[PDB]
Write a protein that binds this ligand. Structure first.
Ligand SMILES: *[C@@H]1O[C@H](CO)[C@@H](O[C@@H]2O[C@H](CO)[C@@H](O[C@@H]3O[C@H](CO[C@H]4O[C@H](CO)[C@@H](O)[C@H](O)[C@@H]4O[C@@H]4O[C@H](CO)[C@@H](O)[C@H](O)[C@H]4NC(C)=O)[C@@H](O)[C@H](O[C@H]4O[C@H](CO)[C@@H](O)[C@H](O)[C@@H]4O[C@@H]4O[C@H](CO)[C@@H](O[C@@H]5O[C@H](CO)[C@@H](O)[C@H](O)[C@@H]5O)[C@H](O)[C@H]4NC(C)=O)[C@@H]3O)[C@H](O)[C@H]2NC(C)=O)[C@H](O)[C@H]1NC(C)=O
Ligand SMILES: *[C@@H]1O[C@H](CO)[C@@H](O[C@@H]2O[C@H](CO)[C@@H](O[C@@H]3O[C@H](CO[C@H]4O[C@H](CO)[C@@H](O)[C@H](O)[C@@H]4O[C@@H]4O[C@H](CO)[C@@H](O)[C@H](O)[C@H]4NC(C)=O)[C@@H](O)[C@H](O[C@H]4O[C@H](CO)[C@@H](O)[C@H](O)[C@@H]4O[C@@H]4O[C@H](CO)[C@@H](O[C@H]5O[C@H](CO)[C@@H](O)[C@H](O)[C@@H]5O)[C@H](O)[C@H]4NC(C)=O)[C@@H]3O)[C@H](O)[C@H]2NC(C)=O)[C@H](O)[C@H]1NC(C)=O
Ligand SMILES: *[C@@H]1O[C@H](CO)[C@@H](O[C@@H]2O[C@H](CO)[C@@H](O[C@H]3O[C@H](CO[C@H]4O[C@H](CO)[C@@H](O)[C@H](O)[C@@H]4O)[C@@H](O)[C@H](O[C@@H]4O[C@H](CO)[C@@H](O)[C@H](O)[C@@H]4O)[C@@H]3O)[C@H](O)[C@H]2NC(C)=O)[C@H](O)[C@H]1NC(C)=O
Ligand SMILES: *[C@@H]1O[C@H](CO)[C@@H](O[C@@H]2O[C@H](CO)[C@@H](O)[C@H](O)[C@H]2NC(C)=O)[C@H](O)[C@H]1NC(C)=O
Length: 322
């Protein structure tokens, strides 16, 4: 007689027993694959005398895991919440992921691992270094600090901080490197020849202590009036007193700091150590005028050879430039 032929392969299903032909009266069973379900479940069929498998209503669809698109204080990456898909998690700034960063919809239609949670990153109160106080610190969570909170140390008087005064609460719930505070001392500074030095009346001199210098008349400082004890045990500078120069000529228009001046007028009480000036000289060939420089160095200034002071003719200073 007739036989039923090989049964149709339906999506996400298996047939048992699967043969290429069946005698009338034999049974087959469609089941959905693991991870899938159908309206009606298993369909059984018996090969009829006609050899025609009847019509199969079985539609197998993925198990759907419970909705997981919202992570408080974070983000979920997903397409669909159905077997066998994966979803990823990450947290907003200042939170850490408390749990696995991904989960799968199992053939049983639950999440594996369990869904995680975002929690606030926190550090405990930080430690004071030795010979330091805590200027800026107030807990922002209980008595703990939140991510990217800061604390600031100042050293004790006579102490230089090596490192940095500001620590930050890290992702790892620990703070950044603490700075060190050490006592630092400087020598007494030397009185300069032709000058004097003032510093405070005490036996040892410490970090951030100041000395001031001065000069006798006809002398001026070749560096700053004020110096301090640096963190490296020395001084900012050690200035000397140097001789002023007498005006090297009687009358001359010169450049001083980009601007023409009468050297007689500008330097009536002499020139200080370092005062630079430019005299005007004539190029007799091209009947035009150039400058050369001249500096007061410790009571000496060399007026250029090319310069000619005029005791009716024209001064270099009054001639067109070259
Ligand atoms: C807050 O809490 C946090 C939580 O733990 C703390 O975070 C930790 O920070 C510490 C370091 O302070 C971490 O430990 C250390 O890890 C160092 C780096 O390891 C990487 O390199 C290793 C190379 O062997 C390798 O094993 C790792 O795989 C790792 O690599 C990387 O992978 C990532 C991806 O995941 C990539 O993105 C990276 O690019 C990749 N990097 C590399 C290099 O591959 C490690 O070096 C360090 O070791 C020192 O201390 C050990 C103490 O026991 C000691 O045993 C070690 O020998 C080493 O020391 C030194 O030895 C090394 C050589 O091994 C010397 O280096 C060289 O010198 C050569 C000259 O001959 C030269 O040729 C080379 O170029 C090189 O310069 C080095 O000089 C030696 N130093 C000294 C002083 O002797 C240590 O294992 C820890 O893992 C972190 N944990 C976390 C969770 O982050 C944090 O510290 C806390 N903060 C505070 C403020 O307390
Ligand atoms: C910043 O962060 C800091 C650091 O954390 C934080 O400072 C902490 O501040 C808290 C509170 O300010 C301190 O806490 C606890 O204080 C207890 C005193 O009081 C209680 O009584 C008053 C009465 O008016 C009541 O109002 C309180 O709510 C509280 O009592 C409660 O009692 C009811 C009863 O009806 C219970 O239902 C509640 O559970 C209970 N509530 C609480 C919160 O406890 C003080 O006695 C406690 O001391 C504990 O825990 C300490 C942990 O370090 C531990 O050192 C102590 O030794 C003690 O633990 C005792 O442990 C014994 C065993 O080891 C146990 O022995 C017996 O009991 C059982 C029987 O079943 C057996 O073990 C045994 O057989 C034996 O019989 C004791 O019972 C047990 N004692 C208690 C009382 O449970 C708490 O400290 C913190 O101490 C303090 N921490 C530090 C480090 O300073 C600060 O608040 C934060 N700042 C800010 C702004 O948030
Ligand atoms: C108060 O205190 C201290 C003295 O106790 C003074 O600190 C000294 O300052 C100098 C320069 O300001 C520094 O030394 C050297 O720094 C530079 C750069 O150094 C880097 O590069 C070198 C490679 O050359 C490498 O090792 C490192 O990467 C390093 O970071 C150098 O160019 C220079 O190095 C040499 O100095 C030698 C003289 O000692 C010469 O022979 C060399 O030809 C070359 O110039 C420089 O000296 C240090 O920070 C420090 N030195 C020491 C010995 O402690 C500070 O200046 C002083 N201040 C005042 C205001 O008086
Ligand atoms: C101590 O070190 C910190 C960390 O490097 C410095 O902070 C940085 O400051 C600069 C300019 O102020 C910024 O561009 C950076 O973004 C800061 N980094 C961080 C992690 O905050 C700080 O300036 C240093 N303190 C001193 C006194 O030098």
């Amino acid at each position: 007689g007739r036989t039923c032929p090989k049964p149709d392969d339906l999506p996400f299903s298996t047939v048992v027993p699967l043969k290429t032909f069946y005698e009338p009266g034999e049974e087959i069973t469609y089941s959905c694959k693991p991870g899938y379900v159908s309206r009606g479940g298993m369909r059984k069929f018996i090969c009829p005398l006609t050899g025609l498998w009847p019509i199969n209503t079985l539609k197998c669809t993925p198990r759907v895991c419970p909705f997981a698109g919202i992570l408080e204080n974070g983000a979920v990456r997903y397409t669909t919440f159905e077997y066998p898909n994966t979803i990823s998690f990450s947290c907003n700034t200042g939170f850490y992921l408390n749990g696995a960063d991904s989960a799968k919809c199992t053939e049983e239609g639950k999440w594996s691992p369990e869904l995680p949670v975002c929690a606030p990153i926190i550090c405990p109160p930080p430690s004071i270094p030795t010979f330091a106080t805590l200027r800026v610190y107030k807990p922002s969570a209980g008595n703990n600090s939140l991510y990217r909170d800061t604390a600031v140390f100042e050293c004790l008087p006579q102490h230089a901080m090596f490192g940095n005064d500001t620590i930050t609460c890290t992702t790892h719930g620990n703070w950044t490197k603490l700075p060190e505070c050490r006592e630092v001392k400087c020598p007494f500074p030397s009185r300069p020849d032709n000058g004097f030095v003032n510093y405070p009346a005490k036996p040892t001199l410490y970090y951030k202590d100041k000395a001031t210098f001065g000069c006798h008349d006809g002398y001026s400082l070749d560096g700053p009036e004020e110096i301090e004890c640096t963190k490296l045990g020395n001084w900012s500078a050690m200035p000397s007193c140097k001789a002023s120069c007498k005006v090297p000529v009687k009358k001359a228009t010169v450049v001083y700091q980009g601007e023409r001046v009468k050297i007689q007028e500008k330097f009536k009480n002499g020139m200080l150590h370092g005062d630079k000036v430019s005299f005007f000289c004539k190029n007799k060939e091209k009947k035009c005028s150039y400058t050369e420089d001249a500096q007061c160095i410790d009571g000496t200034i060399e007026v250029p050879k090319c310069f000619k002071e005029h005791s009716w003719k024209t001064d270099a200073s009054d001639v067109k430039p070259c």
